[PDB]
Design a protein around this ligand. Structure first.
Ligand SMILES: OC[C@H]1O[C@H](O[C@H]2[C@H](O)[C@@H](O)[C@@H](O[C@H]3[C@H](O)[C@@H](O)[C@@H](O)O[C@@H]3CO)O[C@@H]2CO)[C@H](O)[C@@H](O)[C@@H]1O
Length: 478
């Protein structure tokens, strides 16, 4: 439950949630405010749904890429930290969580995928992806396998795909280009294809998941795996003597892994915005509190300058740093979610016999990424800002309706061809008047959607326009 004067935090299961809870007790002890940290499945999917109802967490913890669609939907509060606190974190990590020149989250850490090898089994880790099959021949004969890592989540197959030149989006002119996607180019084809090649030759099983790969490495069944800093705690427990080095090259070129920044979003809905700023600024982002999270599950290289000095010294952190530089940092555009979904199916269909690599990637490329910016391109910009909240399906509804209501009003009235800009104001108060209606209607226990309430929008737009026209008609008259 979400209530005034209690702080609720959502964080992903593989992160140090026990450690963050530990900071919670340091907060509650000094501030008297309970902190409750839970890690539900699919939180980054659950968040946009219950944020609408207004019963989402106070603080949401995910990699920065997810915070685009959130900031666009206005699910996140604007972060206003004094310049002094800003200087504490890396200027690089501040940029990750910046949307439309607004800071919409607090960067916690920089995480990057790395290669992990078992020093006993493998004297020296491979330098290229292409050496791995010949290892597997030797490895299998010793009853072990060469490489195990999950194929069920694209984050992991991507450093390979991106390697010979695959890319999520072109970047030119300081803006990301949504009509320019590079999932299906020759480069990314060579990548995914290499990976299936491993599946076809039985060097990897297509069905492996994080659970399987983790388990297999900790037990010494496999010699290598690809994972992030949150993986080190569980291996430390294990008997395994591991090593964390740079990702194997593809076709003579570095593995280019996607780099994520762990970020702390505040809920726009929260009563306790002030308690959330206070917690993240004075208790989470200090050395003593970062160390607290870190001891549970390693953060990687943190965003906090001071505590990072001491971390960089760990060859594992500088190794993670090393792959972060050889890779690129995830966009935080709203489409990024639809990108990730679009790929995840493609790898899986590639790994399955579901479809060939070529058709698999084509589809990932073919996909029509939704754009509020594009849908609203005609609309008066002030209106569009209001209109961003609504999900893309509902937007199609309101677009079609608004446009008919205009056409109709022009039909009844010869003398004036109203521009959309002219009607901008009568739409705003109409779209507001609709939000209220769905609430008044929400009481009385009748649940309405914009789809249902399409009739009601239409009439309200017209009624309002007719009022404005009465205003204009009275206005002409002497
Ligand atoms: O299945 C749900 C999910 O698919 C997409 O998730 C991507 C994440 O956005 C992206 O941040 C990255 O997540 C990894 C984290 O960076 C890392 O810290 C660690 O926790 O593992 C995560 C991957 O296992 O990669 C995934 C896709 O692989 C998409 O964003 C979501 O729309 C969607 O909820």
């Amino acid at each position: 439950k979400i209530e005034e004067g209690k702080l609720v935090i959502w964080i992903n299961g593989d992160k140090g949630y026990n450690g963050l809870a530990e900071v919670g007790k340091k907060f509650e002890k000094d501030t008297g405010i309970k902190v409750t940290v839970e890690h539900p499945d699919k939180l980054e999917e659950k968040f946009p749904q219950v944020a609408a109802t207004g019963d989402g967490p106070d603080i949401i913890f995910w990699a920065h890429d997810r915070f685009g669609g959130y900031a666009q939907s206005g699910l996140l509060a604007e972060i206003t930290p004094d310049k002094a606190f800003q200087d504490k974190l890396y200027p690089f990590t501040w940029d990750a969580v910046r949307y439309n020149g607004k800071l919409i989250a607090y960067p916690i850490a920089v995480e990057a995928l790395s290669l992990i090898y078992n020093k006993d089994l493998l004297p020296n880790p491979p330098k290229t992806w292409e050496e791995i099959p010949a290892l597997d021949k030797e490895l299998k004969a010793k009853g072990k396998s060469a490489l195990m890592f999950n194929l069920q989540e694209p984050y992991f197959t991507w450093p390979l795909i991106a390697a010979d030149g695959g890319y999520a989006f072109k970047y030119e002119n300081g803006k990301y280009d949504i009509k320019d996607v590079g999932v299906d180019n020759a480069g990314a084809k060579a990548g995914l294809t290499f990976l299936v090649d491993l599946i076809k030759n039985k060097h990897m099983n297509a069905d492996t998941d994080y659970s399987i790969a983790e388990a297999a490495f900790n037990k010494g069944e496999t010699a290598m795996t690809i994972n992030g800093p949150w993986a080190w705690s569980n291996i430390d427990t294990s008997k395994v003597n591991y090593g964390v080095t740079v990702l194997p090259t593809f076709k003579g070129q570095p593995s280019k892994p996607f780099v994520g920044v762990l970020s702390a979003g505040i809920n726009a809905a929260s009563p306790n915005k002030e308690l959330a700023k206070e917690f993240l600024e004075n208790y989470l982002l200090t050395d003593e509190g970062l160390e607290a999270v870190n001891k549970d599950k390693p953060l990687g290289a943190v965003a906090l300058k001071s505590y990072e000095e001491e971390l960089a010294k760990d060859p594992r952190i500088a190794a993670t740093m090393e792959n972060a530089q050889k890779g690129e940092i995830m966009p935080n555009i709203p489409q990024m979610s639809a990108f990730w979904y679009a790929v995840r199916t493609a790898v899986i269909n590639a790994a399955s016999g579901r479809q060939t690599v070529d058709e698999a990637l084509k589809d990932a490329q073919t996909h029509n990424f939704d754009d509020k910016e594009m849908l609203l391109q005609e609309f008066p910009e002030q209106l569009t800002n209001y209109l961003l909240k609504y999900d893309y399906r509902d937007l199609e509804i309101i677009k079609a309706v608004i446009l008919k209501a205009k056409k109709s009003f022009n039909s009844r009235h010869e003398d004036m061809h109203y521009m959309l800009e002219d009607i901008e104001d009568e739409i705003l108060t109409s779209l507001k008047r609709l939000k209220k209606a769905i609430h008044d209607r929400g009481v009385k226990g009748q649940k309405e959607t914009i789809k249902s309430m399409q009739a009601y929008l239409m009439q309200t737009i017209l009624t309002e326009l007719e009022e404005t026209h009465a205003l204009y008609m009275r206005r002409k008259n002497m």
